[PDB]
Write a structure and sequence with these properties.
Keywords: nuclear pore complex, nucleocytoplasmic transport, alpha-helical solenoid, nuclear pore, transport protein
Structural class of chain A: mainly beta
Largest interface: B-C, 44 and 42 residues
Distance between the termini of chain B: 92 Å
Strand content of chain B: under 5%
Shape of chain B: rod-shaped
Number of helices of chain A: 0
Number of strands of chain A: 23
Number of helices of chain B: 15
Organism of A: Homo sapiens
Oligomer: part of a larger assembly
Largest sheet of chain B: none
Order of helices and strands of chain B: HHHHHHHHHHHHHHH
Chain A: SEC13
Order of helices and strands of chain A: EEEEEEEEEEEEEEEEEEEEEEE
PDB class: transport protein
Structural class of chain B: mainly alpha
Strand order of the largest sheet of chain A: 1-2-3-4
Entry title: Composite structure of the human nuclear pore complex (NPC) cytoplasmic face generated with a 12A cryo-ET map of the purified HeLa cell NPC
Chain lengths: 274, 221, 113
C-alpha cells in the first residue's frame, strides 16, 4: 500500500532512495536497478510528508524533510540506525519545499512554508540551528530553489504568482530581495534554477495556470527574458519542473500522467525531446 | 567560411548528429584543415559530452570534455563528473588509462575521500576533518606514522597530546581539555589521558595535575 | 498529481504506483544512436590517438594533439550503411592525403595531392 507518494530523492551517488508519502512515513530504499530493497521506514510527522532531500555527503548522511505538520525534521543515519537529530518549525503553516544549498555554503537548508516565509537554517558548531528567516510571499510560498555560483542567491515561487530572486548581503545579514518576476495567473507551483555554468542562466517556472515560463538572464546585468515554453495551456495543471545537470534539459511533471522534456535549440526556443 | 555555413547548417537541418559535428570540428581543428570558434568547438563538445553522460558513458564523456577550450568550464565539468562517478571510473585498465588521462591527483583522491565519508581514506587525508578521522581511529605504530605525516605537513592541541603519548605537561593537559570541550572521541581521549596519568603516578604537583569517570575520580580521592 | 526531478546521475524519477517504491528509475532515452560508442575498445584506441597536456591556467587535462581522422571510425561501421558513406566521403574530402613519392619542389607536391 502506497497509493500516493508526494516526493522522492536520490543521494549524490544514487544508492539510497528516500520516498515520502501522505501516511507521514518516509521510506528509505537500497536501490539496485530493478530491486529497491526497503531498508527503513521513518515515522515522525503529523501530516503528509511533502518533500524529502538528502544533503551533501560531506555532511555525513543527513536528510531534511518537510511535512504538513508545519515542522521541518532533520534526520540522520547513525551506525545503520536512523534518528531525528534536529527540527525547525518556525513556520505557522504547512511547509512545502526544503532544499539544501551548494556544499560550499556550509550545510545551509532552504525551507519554504505557507506562512509566506522562507528560512535558511545553519547548523553551528554544536550542531544546533541558527535560523535567519525572511518574508517571501503574501498568500504563501509553494516552492524555493537554490542557485549555484562562484553573491549567493535563490528563487521562490509564490501563491501570488510571483517568482522572486533573493541574494545574500553582509550589510543586512538577512537575504535581501533583488528581483521579482511576474508572469503567471495562478499559484506558482514549482521554480527551478539550472545548474548550467554556461554563458547564461535559466529558470523554469511551472504554474497552476498550465504554463511554464523560462527566465533566461543574459548575464549579471541585463534583466530576465520571459519565454512561455509553448504558447498553449497544458491539458492539466503543472506541478514540478526540474533541470538536468549535464545538458540543460528540462523535465516537466504535469498533472497529465506523463513527464515532458524540453531542450533549448539554436533558435533559443525550446523543443520537445524523448 | 565553413563555420558560417556550419552554423547555417545547424539551424536548418539535423542531418549532422551531435557526435559527427563534434568529430568534424575536432578533426578540422587539429589538422589545420579549417577554423572554428573556441565557442563553436566548445558548444559541439559540450553537446556530445552531455549525450555521452546521458548514456552512462562516463569515461567517454570525460574524454570528450577535455576538448574544451574554456579552462574554467573544463575544470568544473571534469571535477563534478569525477567526484559524482568515481566508483565506476576505477574498474579495469581501460578505466585506468582513463583516470590516467591527466586527472589531477587531488581531484581523484578528494572524490575518493568523499565516497568514504558517505559509506562510513586516511592516507589520502595525509596527502576539523582530520579531528574526525582521529576520532574514528580512537596502534602505536599507526600513531607514530600519523605524527610523522603531520610533521611533514607542517589541531595544535592534538599534536601536543600525540607528542606526550610518544614520550609542559600541564600545558598539554589544558590543550587536551580544550580539545575535549570542542563528543564520544573526546571522552575516550580524556579517559586515555587519565589512564596515562595514573600510570605515571605509579605531592603538590600531582594534585595540580589532577585538578564512570566521576566514580573513578571519587575512588582516586 | 505527478512529481519528477533530475538525478545526480542525470536520469529521471517519477510517480509510479506499479513498482515497489512508488517511483521509477528511468534510464533517460539517449539521442546518442551509434553502436560502437558503447564498446570500450573504441574509446581505448581513440585515447591512443591523443596527446594530453595540463592547462596553462589550471592543472586539468585538455587536448594538445589529436590524430583523429574520419578514416579511423570506418572500421567500426558497416561498409553498406549510409553512415559509412558519410564518414567515408568526409574522409576523402577532409583527411589529409599523403603522397609517398619524393617531389622535385613542393608546389608540385601540392598539385599531385
Amino acid at each position: 500500500h502506497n497509493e500516493l507518494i508526494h516526493d522522492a530523492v536520490l543521494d549524490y551517488y544514487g544508492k539510497r532512495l528516500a520516498t515520502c508519502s501522505s501516511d507521514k512515513t518516509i521510506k528509505i530504499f537500497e536501490v539496485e536497478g530493478e530491486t529497491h530493497k526497503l531498508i527503513d521506514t521513518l515515522t515522525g510527522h503529523e501530516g503528509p510528508v511533502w518533500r524529502v532531500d538528502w544533503a551533501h555527503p560531506k555532511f555525513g548522511t543527513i536528510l531534511a524533510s518537510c511535512s504538513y505538520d508545519g515542522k521541518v525534521l532533520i534526520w540522520k543515519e547513525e551506525n545503520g540506525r536512523w534518528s531525528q537529530i534536529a527540527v525547525h518549525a518556525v513556520h505557522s503553516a504547512s511547509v512545502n519545499s526544503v532544499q539544501w544549498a551548494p556544499h560550499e555554503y556550509g550545510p545551509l537548508l532552504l525551507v519554504a512554508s505557507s506562512d509566506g516565509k522562507v528560512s535558511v537554517v545553519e547548523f553551528k558548531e554544536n550542531g544546533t540551528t541558527s535560523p535567519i528567516i525572511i518574508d517571501a510571499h503574501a498568500i504563501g510560498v509553494n516552492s524555493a530553489s537554490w542557485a549555484p555560483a562562484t553573491s549567493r542567491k535563490f528563487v521562490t515561487g509564490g501563491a501570488d504568482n510571483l517568482v522572486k530572486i533573493w541574494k545574500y548581503n553582509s550589510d543586512a545579514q538577512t537575504y535581501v530581495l533583488e528581483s521579482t518576476l511576474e508572469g503567471h495567473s495562478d499559484w506558482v507551483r514549482d521554480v527551478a534554477w539550472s545548474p548550467t555554468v554556461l554563458l547564461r542562466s535559466y529558470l523554469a517556472s511551472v504554474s497552476q495556470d498550465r504554463t511554464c515560463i523560462i527566465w533566461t538572464q543574459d548575464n549579471e546585468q541585463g534583466p530576465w527574458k520571459k519565454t512561455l515554453l509553448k504558447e498553449e495551456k497544458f491539458p492539466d495543471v503543472l506541478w514540478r519542473a526540474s533541470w538536468s545537470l549535464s545538458g540543460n534539459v528540462l523535465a516537466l511533471s504535469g498533472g497529465d500522467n506523463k513527464v515532458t522534456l524540453w531542450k533549448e535549440n539554436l533558435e533559443g526556443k525550446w523543443e520537445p525531446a524523448g | 567560411n565553413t563555420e558560417k555555413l556550419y552554423k547555417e547548417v545547424r539551424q536548418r537541418t539535423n542531418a549532422l548528429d551531435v557526435q559527427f559535428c563534434w568529430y568534424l570540428i575536432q578533426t578540422l581543428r587539429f589538422n589545420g584543415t579549417r577554423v572554428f570558434s573556441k565557442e563553436t568547438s566548445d558548444e559541439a563538445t559540450f553537446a556530445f559530452a552531455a549525450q555521452l553522460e546521458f548514456a552512462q558513458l562516463h569515461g567517454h564523456s570525460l574524454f570528450v570534455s577535455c576538448f574544451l577550450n574554456d579552462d574554467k568550464a573544463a575544470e568544473d565539468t571534469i571535477k563534478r563528473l569525477v567526484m559524482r562517478e568515481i566508483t565506476l571510473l576505477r574498474a579495469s585498465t581501460n578505466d585506468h588509462i582513463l583516470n590516467r588521462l591527466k586527472i589531477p591527483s587531488q581531484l581523484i583522491f578528494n572524490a575518493q575521500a568523499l565516497k568514504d565519508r558517505y559509506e562510513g581514506s586516511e592516507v589520502q587525508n595525509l596527502l576539523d576533518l582530520a579531528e574526525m578521522a582521529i576520532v574514528t581511529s580512537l596502534v602505536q605504530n599507526n600513531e607514530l606514522k600519523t605524527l610523522r605525516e603531520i610533521l611533514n605537513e607542517f589541531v595544535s592541541i592534538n599534536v601536543f597530546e600525540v607528542y606526550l603519548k610518544l614520550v609542559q605537561e600541564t600545558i598539554d593537559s589544558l590543550i587536551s581539555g580544550m580539545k575535549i570541550f570542542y563528543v564520544a572521541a573526546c571522552c575516550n581521549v580524556m579517559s586515555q589521558e587519565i589512564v596515562s596519568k595514573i600510570l605515571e603516578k605509579n605531592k603538590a604537583k600531582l594534585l595540580e595535575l589532577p585538578l564512570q569517570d566521576l566514580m573513578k575520580c571519587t575512588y582516586k580521592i | 498529481y505527478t512529481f519528477a526531478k533530475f538525478s545526480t546521475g542525470s536520469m529521471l524519477l517519477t510517480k509510479d504506483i506499479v513498482g515497489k517504491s512508488g517511483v521509477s528509475i528511468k534510464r533517460l532515452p539517449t539521442e546518442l544512436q551509434r553502436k560502437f560508442l558503447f564498446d570500450d575498445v573504441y574509446l581505448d584506441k581513440e585515447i591512443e590517438k591523443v596527446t594530453i597536456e595540463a592547462r596553462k591556467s589550471n592543472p586539468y587535462p585538455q587536448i594538445s594533439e589529436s590524430s583523429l581522422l574520419f578514416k579511423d571510425a570506418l572500421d567500426y561501421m558497416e561498409k553498406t550503411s549510409s553512415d559509412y558513406n558519410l564518414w567515408k566521403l568526409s574522409s576523402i574530402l577532409f583527411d589529409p592525403v599523403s603522397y609517398p613519392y619524393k617531389t622535385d619542389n613542393d608546389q608540385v607536391k601540392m598539385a599531385l595531392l
